[PDB]
Design a protein around this ligand. Structure first.
Ligand SMILES: *[C@@H]1O[C@H](CO)[C@@H](O)[C@H](O)[C@H]1NC(C)=O
Ligand SMILES: *[C@@H]1O[C@H](CO)[C@@H](O)[C@H](O)[C@H]1NC(C)=O
Ligand SMILES: *[C@@H]1O[C@H](CO)[C@@H](O)[C@H](O)[C@H]1NC(C)=O
Ligand SMILES: *[C@@H]1O[C@H](CO)[C@@H](O)[C@H](O)[C@H]1NC(C)=O
Ligand SMILES: *[C@@H]1O[C@H](CO)[C@@H](O)[C@H](O)[C@H]1NC(C)=O
Ligand SMILES: *[C@@H]1O[C@H](CO)[C@@H](O)[C@H](O)[C@H]1NC(C)=O
Ligand SMILES: *[C@@H]1O[C@H](CO)[C@@H](O)[C@H](O)[C@H]1NC(C)=O
Ligand SMILES: *[C@@H]1O[C@H](CO)[C@@H](O)[C@H](O)[C@H]1NC(C)=O
Ligand SMILES: *[C@@H]1O[C@H](CO)[C@@H](O)[C@H](O)[C@H]1NC(C)=O
Lengths: 197, 277, 215, 42, 47, 50
């Protein structure tokens, strides 16, 4: 469940555990402890054999710093993405697919977590589908009628106008259908009757 | 070399961070190919009757008259990005691991995405697939830019003609202007240059009598051999560390690019986006 | 060196003796005896990986040798190499342990490790038609969860304790080196400031602090 | 090295299944050439 | 000695964060007291 | 070395003279005089911030 939050912790832990295990590794000297070369050799050899360990430890520390810089860049990218999601999903409804959860975004709740954030996204998932017979427009009194905001469906014997995301049968009146053009250019136009109030 | 093998073990467990970093890079690259293409749960298939209102995808849909179930545009794009060098690098240590998702699986994912975009439209990325005619699908996509549906329902013929012309012009442009698939060749050329630089430095002396370890172990004495071989065992590790750092930086860049590509495929293919450019 | 002396078809010049490759590797030599063109390919080497379902249910493991045709080490030959310990079942399931080339492995029932091609999902065919629309009738509002890292730990190092330990001459000899002990500390301080700033841009986006009503 | 451990009665004579470390007792110097070994009983 | 203190005796230290868990919890609760009570008005202008 | 030498409550076996830590550093030692178990802890250190 909390996989991407334990990964950075394990990485930061192994970066410190591997940095202390390299102090027992001799880089070309006769010992690893610092107070061993300065207690058995002469300065002309001490200033030569002790530098081979200092150089290796400096290289290891530089490698650790570079790894930390790369990890910090990745964490900065993740934090910018998290801030963008916090500002576009929690502070308002966003019409971006998959950006605020899989489905139609409605709301988002933020929660804290050790070195991380958890977004709970409320998604509108449609279900219980049903087939219907559709048509681009209908023709009444010689003129075509296109839907303003909806979709024409047919229960077989009657043509209704419903929403694009929820079934709501309504009669075809002169309130959600506009007239534009004649009935000789749209391919698939059906006949019916537009009841005016 | 056995003496070098013993000296490497005496040098400590330094060859544990590089292998782990390469494994992490491989896992990240295997995950990037899944968080982008593998976004739909079910695999959709194109219907047999290919009459989608009047438009013609006979160039983006997978063609059955070819071995690896691809499309003409994909066939043109695949055959464009180019002892051999690969086996020579493998004989030295530079071995390439095979990706998890093969080309056939990526092609099937892309075909399922096209099937969901054509048959379902923008509802297969937010839940269950919803059948809808392609003319009505493109008529509902105009209401997001201001143009009403009475324009499409009257100029569907011209729209289909322009779409079929642009689809052909895409292939016409991909067949010319070699500076088109440059960003895909860029990473390949960078990887090739890195693998060449990492293998050419094996013949470059970091300070020694020669570059062959056998000549140093033979034509020298142990008190000087242990000092001469250290200058070469320290330079190669630094070169490998530099290679690993460059690979990590490039993997971060490619991860950012893959996240951008996933965002685009989720906002442009799975629905109509009102974001400019 | 070492290798497999094989018969090659290279046309060497009458004066050439040795032979290299594209990138600094001897691959062919001339026999000091009667003239013959040989080929020096490296010995049989490769990488070994172990697929294990974890030391909590069983101990049966599978061994994958990379870069081999199962004739140079059940037994299966995939584009990744040779897998020994698993059996290629003709079924298809979701991937559990990624091995490569679209062939993953799992631990199933006798309990053993099986290998199978990945499954890209279900197999659904939308019935397209020029007069067919699917309108939903009921909602199933759900709540999904996503996790995002916002901050990292803030570490700090020291040259006088890591490079040198409980010594005095080492600390004096370290000063002769370059400024390698003031730029790394500065980089760590910058990382710490960045990690302290990443929390002020995610959780701190409103000026006022609101409170929930009692009822 | 040597270590005494409970070897409580079990199946027919065989090495029992159980971990037991061996600590050293003596560290006598030697410079011989030992390549064989012969036991002896009372 | 545990691992946290063993690394401390070697030079490596861990600085404490600036925002404690209590402050982050208060920040997360302030965003919920505006998302539930109000709508998308507590992020643009007045709540 | 340097540092405090406190009394340890370890269980050094009669053959174990020295002792290391997680980072392979001498954390405990046996006195060359009469047998006693010690604990070598580093001297008081830290960091200053102005
Ligand atoms: C619509 O018809 C198709 C083809 O018969 C069928 O697969 C689908 O389930 C139907 N949908 C509904 C809910 O009527
Ligand atoms: C279709 O809808 C009309 C609305 O008047 C209704 O009278 C008729 O019975 C319905 N038929 C079916 C098949 O649902
Ligand atoms: C609609 O009515 C007109 C006039 O009666 C007729 O010519 C046309 O064929 C009809 N079309 C349909 C859809 O029935
Ligand atoms: C309707 O769909 C069928 C599918 O085969 C297609 O052949 C036909 O051209 C389309 N147009 C009509 C006649 O509605
Ligand atoms: C689609 O376009 C291709 C272009 O080569 C053409 O060969 C094919 O016949 C076209 N199909 C239709 C139905 O227009
Ligand atoms: C060595 O002697 C053999 C004798 O048969 C001959 O075949 C071969 O060519 C000779 N090679 C050289 C190096 O002269
Ligand atoms: C709609 O779906 C929900 C899912 O929880 C279910 O509880 C409810 O009974 C369904 N109602 C209808 C309209 O069928
Ligand atoms: C030790 O014994 C072996 C027995 O084969 C003998 O070869 C060797 O010379 C002896 N000397 C040593 C100490 O190696
Ligand atoms: C002499 O050294 C031994 C070492 O174990 C120690 O036990 C003993 O107390 C010492 N006695 C004196 C005279 O210091």
């Amino acid at each position: 469940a909390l996989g991407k939050l334990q990964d950075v912790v394990n990485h930061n832990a192994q970066a410190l555990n591997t940095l202390v295990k390299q102090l027992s590794s001799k880089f070309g000297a006769i010992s690893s402890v610092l107070n061993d070369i300065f207690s058995r050799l002469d300065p002309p050899e001490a200033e030569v054999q002790i530098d081979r360990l200092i150089t290796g430890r400096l290289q290891s520390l530089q490698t650790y710093v570079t790894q930390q810089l790369i990890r910090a860049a990745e964490i900065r990218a993740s934090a910018n993405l998290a801030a963008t999601k916090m500002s576009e999903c929690v502070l308002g409804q966003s019409k971006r697919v998959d950006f605020c959860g899989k489905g139609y975004h409605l709301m988002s709740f933020p929660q804290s977590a050790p070195h991380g954030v958890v977004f709970l996204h409320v998604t509108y998932v449609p279900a219980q589908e049903k087939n219907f017979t559709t048509a681009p427009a209908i023709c009444h009194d010689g003129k075509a009628h296109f839907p303003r905001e909806g979709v024409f469906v047919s229960n077989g014997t009657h043509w209704f106008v419903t929403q694009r995301n929820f079934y709501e049968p309504q009669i075809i009146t002169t309130d959600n259908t506009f007239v534009s053009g004649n009935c000789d250019v749209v391919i698939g136009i059906v006949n019916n009757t537009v009841y005016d109030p | 070399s056995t003496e070098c093998s013993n000296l490497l073990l005496q040098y400590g467990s330094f060859c544990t961070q590089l292998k782990r970093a390469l494994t992490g890079i491989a896992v990240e690259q295997d995950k990037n190919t899944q968080e982008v293409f593998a976004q739909v749960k079910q695999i959709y298939k194109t219907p047999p009757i290919k009459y989608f209102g009047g438009f013609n995808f006979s160039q983006i849909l997978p063609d059955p008259s070819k071995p690896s179930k691809r499309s003409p545009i994909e066939d043109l794009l695949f055959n464009k990005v180019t002892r051999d060098l690969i086996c020579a690098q493998k004989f030295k240590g530079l071995t390439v691991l095979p990706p998890l998702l093969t080309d056939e699986m990526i092609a099937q994912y892309t075909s399922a995405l096209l099937a969901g975009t054509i048959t379902s439209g923008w509802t297969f990325g937010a839940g269950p697939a919803l059948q809808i005619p392609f003319p009505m699908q493109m008529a509902y996509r105009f209401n997001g830019i201001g143009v009403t549906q009475n324009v499409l329902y009257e100029n569907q013929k011209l729209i289909a003609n322009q779409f079929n012309s642009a689809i052909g012009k895409i292939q016409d442009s991909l067949s010319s202007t070699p500076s088109a698939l440059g960003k895909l060749q860029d990473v390949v050329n960078h990887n090739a240059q890195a693998l060449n630089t990492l293998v050419k430095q094996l013949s470059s002396k970091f300070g020694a009598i020669s570059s062959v370890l056998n000549d140093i172990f033979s034509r020298l004495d142990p008190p000087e051999a242990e000092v001469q071989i250290d200058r070469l065992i320290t330079g190669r590790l630094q070169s490998l560390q530099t290679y690993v750092t460059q690979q990590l930086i490039r993997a971060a860049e490619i991860r950012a690019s893959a996240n951008l590509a996933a965002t685009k495929m989720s906002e442009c293919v799975l629905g109509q986006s009102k974001r400019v450019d | 060196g070492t290798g497999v002396l094989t018969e090659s078809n290279k046309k060497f010049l009458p004066f050439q003796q040795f032979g290299r490759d594209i990138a600094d590797t001897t691959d062919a030599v001339r026999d000091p005896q009667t003239l013959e063109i040989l080929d020096i390919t490296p010995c049989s080497f490769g990488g070994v990986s172990v697929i294990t379902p974890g030391t909590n249910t069983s101990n049966q493991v599978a061994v994958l040798y990379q870069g081999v045709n199962c004739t140079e080490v059940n037994v299966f030959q995939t584009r990744a190499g040779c897998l020994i310990g698993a059996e290629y079942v003709n079924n298809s399931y979701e991937c559990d342990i990624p091995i490569g080339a679209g062939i993953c492995a799992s631990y199933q029932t006798s309990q053993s490790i099986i290998a199978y091609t990945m499954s890209l999902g279900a197999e659904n065919s939308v019935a397209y038609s020029n007069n067919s629309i699917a309108i939903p009738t009921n909602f199933t509002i759900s709540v999904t969860t996503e996790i995002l890292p916002v901050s990292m730990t803030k570490t700090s190092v020291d040259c006088t304790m890591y490079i040198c330990g409980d010594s005095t001459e080492c600390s004096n000899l370290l000063l002769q080196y370059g400024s390698f002990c003031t730029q790394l500390k500065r980089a760590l301080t910058g990382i710490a400031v960045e990690q302290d700033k990443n929390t002020q841009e995610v959780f701190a986006q409103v000026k006022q602090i609101y409170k929930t009503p009692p009822i | 090295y040597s270590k005494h451990t409970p070897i409580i009665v079990r199946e027919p004579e065989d090495l029992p299944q159980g971990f037991s470390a061996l600590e050293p007792l003596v560290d006598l110097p030697i410079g011989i050439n030992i390549t064989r070994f012969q036991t002896l009983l009372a």
